């Protein structure tokens, strides 16, 4: 019952940076702490064990320090291959337990999203459902607020969104949000709008259409 807490949950860094990630145990674990690296879809890889011992084959730019309850993983001169998620794990006593992970992401300059709204297709409407989609293209950082308004009333509970991983060329994110209504509900309203708030925008951007004028 040893709880491991990592901080931060995520950070953005540049190639060449000295990156530090911390791990705290709810009670002493002596030196018995290990660090793992994991990339999307792949198995974790052992980096450091016993707080500061480097696993065979792991680059020496990875180092670990700490004892007792407070530990740190340091990556000197971060390399392109190091953008990944890192987990600490205590092996002091059973059950073995992991920290919640720290995601190391790529730092770049602020980029405002381009925003697009798409009405539901006639083919979909025929089947009884209306999906309205809002796209935020190529923005940075990740934090973004997308709000749906229907006849100028804020919607809640009827949308889902997802976000891409950082683009391999420009390190930006993109985001899609889908508002889903029944055809009958869709046909009772006029104005459909997606309002986007993001650091790169001086004020919120709204894209909209009117049913019957689209």
């Amino acid at each position: 019952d040893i709880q491991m807490t990592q901080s931060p949950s995520s950070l953005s860094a540049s190639v060449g940076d000295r990156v530090t990630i911390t791990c705290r145990a709810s009670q002493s674990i002596g030196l018995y702490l290990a660090w793992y690296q994991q990339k999307p879809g792949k198995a974790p890889k052992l980096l450091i064990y016993a707080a500061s011992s480097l696993q065979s084959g792991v680059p020496s730019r990875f180092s670990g320090s700490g004892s007792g309850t407070d530990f740190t993983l340091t990556i000197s001169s971060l390399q392109p291959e190091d953008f990944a998620t890192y987990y600490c794990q205590q092996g002091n006593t059973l059950p073995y337990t992991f920290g919640q992970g720290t995601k190391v992401e790529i730092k770049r300059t602020v980029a405002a999203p381009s925003v697009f709204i798409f009405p539901p297709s006639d083919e979909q409407l025929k089947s009884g459902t209306a999906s309205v989609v809002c796209l935020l293209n190529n923005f940075y950082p990740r934090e973004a607020k997308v709000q749906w308004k229907v006849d100028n009333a804020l919607q809640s509970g009827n949308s889902q969104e997802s976000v891409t991983e950082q683009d391999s060329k420009d390190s930006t994110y993109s985001l899609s949000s889908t508002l889903t209504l029944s055809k009958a509900d869709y046909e009772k309203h006029k104005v459909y709008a997606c309002e986007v708030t993001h650091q790169g925008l001086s004020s919120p951007v709204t894209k909209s259409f009117n049913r019957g004028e689209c």
């Binding site: 974790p44 052992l46 004028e213």
Partner: protein
């Protein structure tokens, strides 16, 4: 080299049993314990338990005790993880890992490639594919976005190409979301020059292997509805 190879992805319904495997090679299988680790979609690693293949001794984390069975067959250098009755909440990637005791602690020095287990009451179903196109007079920039909405399929994944693979620049295919219906939905979009909207055609090609279906959709916006 030391290798752990796991069995293939599983898609099951609640109440069904399941046993997944982890085969070790390039080392003395009986001399190293094997741990199993769960990773729920979008979440971290959770240690489940371990087995010592030399004597069949097992230990489980508290929350996994009585919920799953870890076993091994040393004659074929294989370790197993099994459930008598699956639940949707068992949906996760499962890893086996070799333990190497070093620095006076167990370390997971070699990992299997993972086995994806999806548990749902949903049945196999191919997607419907709908165009994502701007309203007729809304394109007021030099670049426009187009796309396809790939809706109501099970299980993952689908693959989406554009113009039969000819178009790859500026494509974003989003992670699927799981709808309350138990079916998935995703969008794929592409940004193109606005001047091309009336000259060039854009078609998404959507493959769904589990249902053996393929759907092409030319993306446009009709001038009446």
């Amino acid at each position: 080299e030391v290798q752990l190879v796991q069995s293939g992805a599983e898609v099951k319904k609640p109440g069904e049993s399941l046993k997944i495997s982890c085969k070790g090679s390039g080392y003395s299988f009986t001399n190293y314990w094997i741990s199993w680790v769960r990773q729920m979609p979008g979440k971290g690693l959770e240690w489940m338990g371990f087995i010592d293949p030399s004597d069949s001794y097992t230990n489980y984390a508290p929350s996994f005790q009585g919920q799953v069975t870890i076993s091994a067959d040393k004659s074929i250098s294989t370790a197993y993880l099994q459930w008598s009755s699956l639940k949707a909440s068992d949906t996760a990637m499962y890893y086996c890992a070799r333990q190497l005791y070093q620095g006076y602690m167990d370390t997971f020095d070699s990992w299997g490639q993972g086995t994806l287990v999806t548990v749902s009451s949903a049945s196999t179903k191919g997607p419907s594919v709908f165009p994502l196109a701007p309203c007729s007079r809304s394109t007021s920039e030099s670049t426009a976005a187009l796309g396809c909405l790939v809706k109501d399929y099970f299980p993952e994944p689908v693959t989406v190409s554009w113009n039969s693979g000819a178009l790859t620049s500026g494509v974003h295919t989003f992670p699927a979301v799981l709808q309350s219906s138990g079916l998935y939905s995703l969008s794929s979009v592409v940004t193109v020059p606005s001047s091309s909207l009336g000259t060039k055609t854009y078609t998404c090609n959507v493959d769904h292997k589990p249902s053996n279906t393929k759907v092409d959709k030319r993306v446009h916006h009709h001038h009446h509805h």
